[PDB]
Design a protein around this nucleic acid. Sequence first.
RNA 1: GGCAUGCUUGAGGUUCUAACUCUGGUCCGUAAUCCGGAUCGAGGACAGUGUAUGGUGGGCAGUUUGACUGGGGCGGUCUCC
RNA 2: CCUUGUCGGGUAAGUUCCGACCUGCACGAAUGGCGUAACGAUGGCGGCGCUGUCUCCACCCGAGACUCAGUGAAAUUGAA
RNA 3: GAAAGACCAAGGGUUCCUGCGCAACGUUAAUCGACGCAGGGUUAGUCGGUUCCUAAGGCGAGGCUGAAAAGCGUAGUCGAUGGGAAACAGGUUAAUAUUCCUGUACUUCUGGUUACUGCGAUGGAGGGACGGAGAAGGCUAGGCCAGCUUGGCGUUGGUUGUCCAAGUUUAAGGUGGUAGGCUGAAAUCUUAGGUAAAUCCGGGGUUUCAAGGCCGAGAGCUGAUGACGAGUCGUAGAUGACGAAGUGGUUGAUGCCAUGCUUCCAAGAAAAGCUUCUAAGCUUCAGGUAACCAGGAACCGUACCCCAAACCGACACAGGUGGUCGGGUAGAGAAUACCAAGGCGCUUGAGAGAACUCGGGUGAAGGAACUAGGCAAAAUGGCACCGUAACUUCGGGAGAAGGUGCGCCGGCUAGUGAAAAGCUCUGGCUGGUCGAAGAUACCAGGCCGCUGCGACUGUUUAUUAAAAACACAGCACUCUGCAAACACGAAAGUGGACGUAUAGGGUGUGACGCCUGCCCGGUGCCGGAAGGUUAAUUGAUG
Lengths: 271, 44
Amino acid sequence: IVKCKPTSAGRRFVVKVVNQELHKGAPYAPLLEKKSKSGGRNNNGRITTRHIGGGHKQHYRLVDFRRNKDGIPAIVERVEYDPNRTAHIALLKYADGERRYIIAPKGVAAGDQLISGIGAPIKAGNSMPLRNIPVGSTVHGIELKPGKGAQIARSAGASAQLVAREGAYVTLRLRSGEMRKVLAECRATLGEVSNSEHSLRSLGKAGATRWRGVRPTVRGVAMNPVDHPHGGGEGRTSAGRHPVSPWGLQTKGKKTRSNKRTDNMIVRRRK
Amino acid sequence: MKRTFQPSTLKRARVHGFRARMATKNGRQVLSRRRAKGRKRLTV
RNA sequence: GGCAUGCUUGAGGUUCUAACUCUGGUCCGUAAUCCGGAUCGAGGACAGUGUAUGGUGGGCAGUUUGACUGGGGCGGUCUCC
RNA sequence: CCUUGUCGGGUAAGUUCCGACCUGCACGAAUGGCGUAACGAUGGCGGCGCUGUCUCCACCCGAGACUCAGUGAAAUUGAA
RNA sequence: GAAAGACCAAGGGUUCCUGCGCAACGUUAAUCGACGCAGGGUUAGUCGGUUCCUAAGGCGAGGCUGAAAAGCGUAGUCGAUGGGAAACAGGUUAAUAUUCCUGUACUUCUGGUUACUGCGAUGGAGGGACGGAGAAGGCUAGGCCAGCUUGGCGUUGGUUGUCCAAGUUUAAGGUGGUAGGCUGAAAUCUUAGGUAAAUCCGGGGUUUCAAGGCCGAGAGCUGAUGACGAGUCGUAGAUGACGAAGUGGUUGAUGCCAUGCUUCCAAGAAAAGCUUCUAAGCUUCAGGUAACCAGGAACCGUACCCCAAACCGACACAGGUGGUCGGGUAGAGAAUACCAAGGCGCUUGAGAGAACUCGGGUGAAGGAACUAGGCAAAAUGGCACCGUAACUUCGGGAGAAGGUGCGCCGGCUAGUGAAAAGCUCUGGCUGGUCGAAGAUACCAGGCCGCUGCGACUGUUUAUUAAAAACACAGCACUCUGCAAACACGAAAGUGGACGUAUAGGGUGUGACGCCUGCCCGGUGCCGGAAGGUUAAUUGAUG
């Protein structure tokens, strides 16, 4: 993590994250495919999600989440950059070829973990079911329906903690603060996700956000009464309604969960 | 300067052509209405 | 008074699977995993959906906001002795 | 608001400008409060160079205006 | 003369060329015409299309959803601005040529023949197949110089000359495998993978050897003994024949090697032809392998305009319109000044030389006194060296300010290549000299001191407002545990996102530095249930 010298008006506050562990140039080619840019537009053609557009060409990488190979020792080749994600991914190699990308744990550059219904059991990077692990451990990549794949604790530097165990349900405390009960045969992976040098970065200039795929936002007090309920005014007005979405939704604190189907699996709400 | 009509034959046929009007349901009513007035052309 | 147990019935609590549910897994139609059908896995009389009813609702719509007046706005005045 | 408030600076002379007083009709802290190098086809003042901007205009060169041949409009109009 | 010249794409639709005309048109007259009447005129295996394959996107059998219309979408088949075989030189025309003609080439397909032989998929592998910036180079087109042929002898003063003018051309393809780049190679057994299989790829074991091998401009040789050639000779006006020199030295690109190379984050298209593997089939005729003569390559577009009087603007309208080519002398330069090729004189002219209007030139003595305001004009402007302030986020401010030098003619010293020779050029500091004036013309910074507001580059009211407005990096608050909050949809479903709280929506403030005080009564949200009132639904009793 380096600082930049103020040579220009853009370079004054750029904070980079450089890494020399990353493999310089190539992706492995059969694990790579085409991805198109949406613009934030559904099949009616209209903008649903605002402030998206532009950017750069990207290839989607088929990152493996199931880890269904069992009893095979896998050996890491190298750690690569992945553009549609905040973590680093690793290239694996099993005992008989069959290379494959996974989310990289804290271990890097040819360790050899073992992916099984239980084996070699404890490292960073061993996948094994959630009943055969000690309490108080830190895991990541947690399935919720068995066979479906990792859904929770998957972004950069993220993890969860085991707390309790009884019956079919193995309770864990999420990164947010919510404590879920999770069914016990869903697999998970010991350790933490690789790139934690990511909350320490600053873009510096206005055109740095724009070549990543985020389009300018405009405030609601600088519009007309026809466009946004904060509306127009004379001079700078305090927008004399209570603060509200452009569709009429209260925004400074209003509980909006209404699922009413998964409420049994939650122990404690996030506070 | 730039006037509001820049011509092309590929854009004209795919929007206002016959196989474009005949494809939808409104356009087949545009064909019968413009035919029964008695015009010489039907496909501008 | 209650005694017992019954007969029915409300309200609450727990559990079970067979209804419904699965934007789960693998077979089949199929050279497709959209859609079905078969089987296991999860939830389970909840969710969800009809119909009757409470609440919130400028998100949206149809509309109303008088006259006299030494210009009309402000003020004063509109009936009876 | 009263107001060209009062005091100092700059000009021969300054309702604007700069520095202060504070007696804030009616400043004030994320409708942010006070500072701030570099950047403005940004607002306001002052200075050197420079000049037909100006005292006050004089003269020269082209294209029209004027005369001759060809073609030949427009708005307007109760009647003179 | 970086177009007012040539050429492709659109678009137009006979405006192209020749006879005959001049009423209408053309801002005037017309014998002239992009104008009337009558004929003429576009030649393809290779150039563009069609045929093969796909991107965004469209339509979509079956299928779900919907009062009806219809909506969405799987198999599938359409859609280039991209990806897939092959040709250039010279002659000819009133008007067409990479199309006809001569000359030398290249690619693909079919029918026989012959010598044989494991053939086979739409399915596996391999390949095709790619980002920005930067710098080393290596060539080449081109341009000059010097030779060499044909012709000339003058501007009056000089000029058989160490002079003057012109010309010194040549392709694709062959052979060749260099500058340079990438790359370990070979044998041999074996194998939880390549949704079946595989002798193919992937992984593993041993062994031998230094590496193969794959790409690749361009030079030379050949194509070419030929064509072309100033001219010459035979209404010789038009033509027929002949035709000399055809070479060396330098300087070269923004053009090819380069789809390379190094580096940086924002991590950089698909699919087919092409090569190989096998399944079913296999009858191993068929099918494949080379070799060989034999023949074929269908159909559409080819004229003319194309920074324009032929297209978009009602016009023969100072406007608008994507891409290639682009010589000479000075100059860093595709800027600017004069010119070559090539093209044009802008479809009303002639006078005379009033006021006043427009576009310009010089000015006595003053030098903002003008005015809402130095608006406008004037001035400044190059390269080299010297020199440079407060202030600061330590980069900057800053080419701050401000100053000197510069022309011609002489003395020194009028890269290329044998692992060595001329020409570009491998210096700078000394003299003379002519002018009011040496960046002598076009070309091209006005500078400094205080202060308001916004950190900056940026964006905005097409056609009276470019800002102090909107954006912004940064900061905080809050909602969202995945079939997510949220949005568009009667619904099916799609975005969010093939993402998972270091994430995703919403609201305010707006880099940086020092900081952000008290009030929970009002209104809103969140938390709590004890008690009060309170909806249909039941229906005692009178």
